[PDB]
Amino acid sequence: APNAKQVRWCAISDLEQKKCNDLVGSCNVPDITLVCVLRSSTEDCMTAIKDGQADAMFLDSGEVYEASKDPYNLKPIIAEPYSSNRDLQKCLKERQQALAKKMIGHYIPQCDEKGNYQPQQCHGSTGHCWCVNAMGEKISGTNTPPGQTRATCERHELPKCLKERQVALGFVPQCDEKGNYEPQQFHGSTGYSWCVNAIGEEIAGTKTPPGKIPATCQKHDLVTTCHYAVAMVKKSSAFQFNQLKGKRSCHSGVSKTDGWKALVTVLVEKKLLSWDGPAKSIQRAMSKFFSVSCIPGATQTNLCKQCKGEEGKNCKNSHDEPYYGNYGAFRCLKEDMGDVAFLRSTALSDEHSEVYELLCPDNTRKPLNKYKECNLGTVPAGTVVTRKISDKTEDINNFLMEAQKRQCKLFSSAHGKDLMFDDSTLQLALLSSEVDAFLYLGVKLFHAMKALTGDAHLPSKNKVRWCTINKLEKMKCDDWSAVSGGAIACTEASCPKGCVKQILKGEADAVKLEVQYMYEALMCGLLPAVEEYHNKDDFGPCKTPGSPYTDFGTLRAVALVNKDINWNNIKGKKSCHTGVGDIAGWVIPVSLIRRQNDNSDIDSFFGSCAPGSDTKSNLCKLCTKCSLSDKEAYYGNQGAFRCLVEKGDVAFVPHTVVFENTDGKNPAVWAKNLKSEDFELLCLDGSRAPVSNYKSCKLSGIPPPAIVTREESISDVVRIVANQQSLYGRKGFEKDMFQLFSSNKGNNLLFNDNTQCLITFDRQPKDIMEDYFGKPYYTTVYGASRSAMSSELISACTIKHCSNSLEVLF
Numbered sequence: 154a155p156n157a158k159q160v161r162w163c164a165i166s167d168l169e170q171k172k173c174n175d176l177v178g179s180c181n182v183p184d185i186t187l188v189c190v191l192r193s194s195t196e197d198c199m200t201a202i203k204d205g206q207a208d209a210m211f212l213d214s215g216e217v218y219e220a221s222k223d224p225y226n227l228k229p230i231i232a233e234p235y236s237s238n239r240d241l242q243k244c245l246k247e248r249q250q251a252l253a254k255k256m257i258g259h260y261i262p263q264c265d266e267k268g269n270y271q272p273q274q275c276h277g278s279t280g281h282c283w284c285v286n287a288m289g290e291k292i293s294g295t296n297t298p299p300g301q302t303r304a305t306c307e308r309h310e311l312p313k314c315l316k317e318r319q320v321a322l323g324f325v326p327q328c329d330e331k332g333n334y335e336p337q338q339f340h341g342s343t344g345y346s347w348c349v350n351a352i353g354e355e356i357a358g359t360k361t362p363p364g365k366i367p368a369t370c371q372k373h374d375l376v377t378t379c380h381y382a383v384a385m386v387k388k389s390s391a392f393q394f395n396q397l398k399g400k401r402s403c404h405s406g407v408s409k410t411d412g413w414k415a416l417v418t419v420l421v422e423k424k425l426l427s428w429d430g431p432a433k434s435i436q437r438a439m440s441k442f443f444s445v446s447c448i449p450g451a452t453q454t455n456l457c458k459q460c461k462g463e464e465g466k467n468c469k470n471s472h473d474e475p476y477y478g479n480y481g482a483f484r485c486l487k488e489d490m491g492d493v494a495f496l497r498s499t500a501l502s503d504e505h506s507e508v509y510e511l512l513c514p515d516n517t518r519k520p521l522n523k524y525k526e527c528n529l530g531t532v533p534a535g536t537v538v539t540r541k542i543s544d545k546t547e548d549i550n551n552f553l554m555e556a557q558k559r560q561c562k563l564f565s566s567a568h569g570k571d572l573m574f575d576d577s578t579l580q581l582a583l584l585s586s587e588v589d590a591f592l593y594l595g596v597k598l599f600h601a602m603k604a605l606t607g608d609a610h611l612p613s614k615n616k617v618r619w620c621t622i623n624k625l626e627k628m629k630c631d632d633w634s635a636v637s638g639g640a641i642a643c644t645e646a647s648c649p650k651g652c653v654k655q656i657l658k659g660e661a662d663a664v665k666l667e668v669q670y671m672y673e674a675l676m677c678g679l680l681p682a683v684e685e686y687h688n689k690d691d692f693g694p695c696k697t698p699g700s701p702y703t704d705f706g707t708l709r710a711v712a713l714v715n716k717d718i719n720w721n722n723i724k725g726k727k728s729c730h731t732g733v734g735d736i737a738g739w740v741i742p743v744s745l746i747r748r749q750n751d752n753s754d755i756d757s758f759f760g761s762c763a764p765g766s767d768t769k770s771n772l773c774k775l776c777t778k779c780s781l782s783d784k785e786a787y788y789g790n791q792g793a794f795r796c797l798v799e800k801g802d803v804a805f806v807p808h809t810v811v812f813e814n815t816d817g818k819n820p821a822v823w824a825k826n827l828k829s830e831d832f833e834l835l836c837l838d839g840s841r842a843p844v845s846n847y848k849s850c851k852l853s854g855i856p857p858p859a860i861v862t863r864e865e866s867i868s869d870v871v872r873i874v875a876n877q878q879s880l881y882g883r884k885g886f887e888k889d890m891f892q893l894f895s896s897n898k899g900n901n902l903l904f905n906d907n908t909q910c911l912i913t914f915d916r917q918p919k920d921i922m923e924d925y926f927g928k929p930y931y932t933t934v935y936g937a938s939r940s941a942m943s944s945e946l947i948s949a950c951t952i953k954h955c956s957n958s959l960e961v962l963f
Contacts, residue, residue: 158548161188162573163198163207166472169573172566180561185552195408195450195470199225202538208545211574214533214594215410218602221541221590229593230546231553232536234582236288238333238351238375238959239940243289244270255559262289272306286310286963309963314353326353329940336370336939337920346920351375351954352961366918369678369864372939372951375962379955380577381528382415383501384512385486385494385521392492393516395425401459402443403491405482406470407436407450411497412482414605415529419514431607447485449477459490472569480570497532498524499577531955535575536584536593543586550583557581587945595949596657596677603659610659612866617873618642620652620661625899633903636881636891640873650946653679656863657950663862663870665904668736671925672935672942674861677950681859681925682870683911685904695883695910698875706909707854709808709847710737712835713794716802719839726760727775727801729793733765734781737807738793741853744933745837762787762796775800791819797832798823808834808847853929858905859914871913878911 164170173189180187190207192198195216201207203225212220212227220227244264251261258278263271270289275282280299284292284306295304312332318325326349327335334353339346344363348356348370359368384394392400397420405412417435420426420442428438440453447459450470457468459476466473476485479500486494486509493512501509501521511519513527537553539546556563557580564578574581584593591599603609612618619641621627630643644661646652652664653674663682666674671681686694687706694702718726723746731738746754756771765781766772773779775796776787787793787800790810797804804810811832817825833841834850842850862870880886882893894908904911917924922939923931935941 156184158185158551159188160185160209160545160548160552161190161207163190163192163201163210164573165192165195165198165210165470166477166572167191168472168566168569171568172572175566175568176556176561176563180556180559182552182555182559182561185548185555187552193466193469193471193473195406199227199538202227202540205540209537209539209549211535212538213406213409213411213535214598215414215602216408217536217538217590217593218599219408219606220538222608226541227538228541228543228589229536229538229584230543230588231550231581231583232593233534233578233580235534235953236377236959238288238962239331239943240288241331242268244268247289253558269310272308273303284309286960287312288959288963290958290960292960309960311963313962317353329938330936331940333940336372337367337922339920349373351952352956361918364918366916367920369921371678372676372947373954374948374951375956375959376953377956377958379525379953380532380534381498381524382411382530382532383496383498383524383528384416385483385496385501385509386492386512386518387486387508388510388518389508390492393518394512394514395423395516397493398425398442399444400493401491402446402448402493402495403459403476403482403485404446404448404495405479405497406477407448408470410530410532411479412448412495414602415532416495417605418601419529423514431605431609435605446491447476447482449474449481459485461485461490472572478571495529498528499575525955525957531953533594533598533953534578537581541589546586553581554583585945591654591658592945592949595951595953597952599658612659612662614869615873616640616642616662617870618644618660618662619903620644620646620655620664621903622646622648622652626902628898629896629902632891632896632898633881633893636887637877640877653677653861654946656861662866663860663874665858665860667858668855669734669740671856671859671861672922673944673946675921675925676939676947678864679861680864680867680916680921681914682862682867683860683874683913685858685908686910686912687857687905687907688909689907692909694912698910698913702912705857705912707857708737709851709854710741711806711808711844711847711851712742713797713804713806713811713832713844714802714835715831718803718835719841720835720837721839723803723835724758726803727796728759728803728805729762729775729787729796729801730764730805731789731793732781733763736855738805739763740934741855741930742805745852748933760801762793762800764788764792795823798827803835808844808851811844853933854927856926856930859925860911874911875913883910 162173164173170189170191177187190201192201198210199220217229244262245268247262248264251259260276263274265271270285272284273282274285281296282303284295284304287310297303314326314328314334315332318328324340327338334349336348338349346361346367348359348368351373361367407413426438426442436451436453440456445458446456448456449468451457451468460468460474461476462474468474471477475481479496482494482496483500485491501524506521509521511521511524511527513519519527539549564574564576566572570576616639619630621630621643627643627645634641634643644655646655649666649670655661657677688704691703694700733739743754761772762776763772764776764779764785766779779785782788787796790806793804794810814824815827815829829844832844834844836842836850881888881891894904895906896902900906931937
């Protein structure tokens with residue numbers, strides 16, 4: 154026992170502890186010992202993990218929000234991945250995953266030299282073969298046994314969007330770099346803009362003429378194998394959905410979506426459940442809605458009267474209650490202890506079609522196989538949770554991954570169904586450490602959960618909650634709030650993206666974002682209310698807002714070089730950059746190069762000092778060394794210009810850099826004998842220009858910093874910002890009380906200190922991505938696509954659209 158680790162799994166029932174103790178014996182994972190801690194309910198297992206008495210458990214997706222709060226403070230870490238229409242390199246990953254399993258004779262996907270699925274797939278140990286599309290999905294009916302004539306497989310790899318950009322050039326849709334439909338479509342000849350499904354089908358009520366502001370189009374992902382909450386009834390009964398009041402019911406549990414929450418949402422929407430807002434209880438109204446029921450975990454007696462558990466176990470969130478869970482709820486319906494069962498579609502099977510049918514919110518009934526048309530909503534997968542502090546996440550993940558490779562019986566047991574995990578689970582994958590309850594559920598589901606538990610917040614129309622990113626920003630905001638007359642409040646986040654999440658969560662209202670964060674924020678539906686105006690010379694727009702402007706103060710990214718050089722002979726040259734993350738030094742030039750060649754600039758291109766790269770890549774030679782820090786003398790605008798003068802003659806820098814050190818402003822030894830005439834810049838033609846021609850001899854201009862907010866909060870934010878700006882800041886009536894654009898607490902806190910003022914963003918009848926970024930920046934950096942970058946935040950702002958398979962795209 155040197156590096157011997159313990160993973161304590163919390164079991165809520167005797168049946169779960171039996172299955173868990175089976176895995177302690179039958180499952181040998183090297184260096185990780187499994188321990189089974191027994192509690193009496195779901196809630197007590199959550200408390201045990203919060204107390205450090207257990208490490209992990211599986212929770213229904215409807216329990217994730219409440220688990221993230223006191224008195225539990227748990228966080229999802231491991232969950233079943235879904236098959237998406239945006240999975241890349243799927244055959245290669247599935248082949249690697251299948252080869253990692255410690256078993257002989259299992260199906261291992263076969264890929265070609267490019268990593269595509271081979272159109273024919275075979276299970277080697279059995280001799281069966283079948284056909285397959287680009288996503289590895291079996292073409293229906295093509296499975297043949299050994300010794301039978303095989304189905305001839307075609308390549309089924311052309312996506313739907315690209316096969317309709319050809320039946321046009323022989324309305325032309327806009328497609329991904331991977332052939333997926335873009336969420337926003339623009340008709341090139343009629344000027345219309347509308348929003349499209351994940352299959353490219355038009356969303357109702359989104360078309361706009363050229364003179365109108367386009368609709369707000371959310372990203373979509375086509376996903377397969379969705380489970381649903383359904384109302385299951387016997388065919389011998391006669392009541393419809395709007396006659397549930399007074400009936401006997403049975404639910405999987407009070408905290409699950411398949412047994413609660415989904416039903417409560419539908420009852421409220423259909424106006425069948427009479428109940429005032431939360432804090433005025435949902436259980437009280439439900440206890441008056443149903444006559445007598447079994448709802449495990451319920452605190453009203455009549456909602457527990459139909460439960461069958463023995464004393465001490467009756468109505469518990471535990472398999473010790475025989476009617477708990479999806480199969481327990483069906484059992485209660487079967488034994489006629491209730492008139493209707495609320496459970497997940499996974500509990501349905503064709504053997505129940507003789508006696509059972511589905512109660513639809515349509516006030517109609519349908520067979521079980523119509524559950525995709527007769528349901529109370531989708532139910533996302535459950536997840537393994539642990540403490541937010543994530544002290545044991547590594548050990549928990551290592552055990553489950555190793556247990557899955559070694560074919561341990563994780564997702565089945567002779568003792569019962571849905572023990573420890575959902576039996577329907579096929580695999581468990583580790584989630585990003587960034588993932589919390591908000592990211593896992595997504596923005597829409599999170600707010601539905603937030604509203605159901607009574608934590609919903611309706612912000613003031615007259616107060617703006619400003620999000621800060623550090624203690625210095627919090628102090629300046631506090632100074633701002635103290636003089637704002639109740640118009641400004643302050644919240645705290647760790648970083649700009651944390652502020653973006655708070656705004657989406659309804660915990661904050663506004664934050665200033667640099668350009669690097671605007672792509673994710675605009676993806677999630679946020680909009681810029683006001684922008685930083687930086688024209689130090691012209692002040693007209695700042696004293697009468699709404700008056701036109703000539704230059705917004707935008708920085709312009711230039712290539713600066715006394716020698717011969719043009720944009721076309723840049724390859725194999727001594728070029729430096731301010732940093733790998735900086736926008737002018739790295740983002741825009743690399744985007745130009747990687748579009749005029751095929752994506753190899755990690756110095757298989759150039760010669761080049763670009764800090765923040767591999768220790769001795771070809772980069773860090775012209776640059777202890779090559780650090781994203783002041784300790785590298787070639788970092789920043791001042792840096793990488795010391796390169797331009799000393800080590801090589803080409804620099805990727807903003808237009809301001811030369812004026813900062815030309816004509817003698819930066820002593821040292823080198824930096825005050827150069828002239829503004831000694832350095833000139835390279836245009837995109839290949840010509841040269843004087844360094845003040847940066848407004849024409851430019852690679853690109855970078856958009857200004859924007860204060861973002863929700864769409865519904867826009868009008869109130871600009872009006873409060875405008876009112877507050879007239880009072881405080883540059884040339885304000887009471888600016889001796891407070892300053893917006895400077896502070897004794899620090900520099901560049903809430904806004905950049907060199908900001909002249911804040912100008913209200915005026916939305917043009919164009920795509921919001923091009924409206925803020927500008928088409929030169931949008932096309933060069935993101936390819937004018939909504940799929941150029943992916944993150945956990947963008948995924949949480951993506952609508953999951955279900956489908957029986959992905960074959961609709963081929």
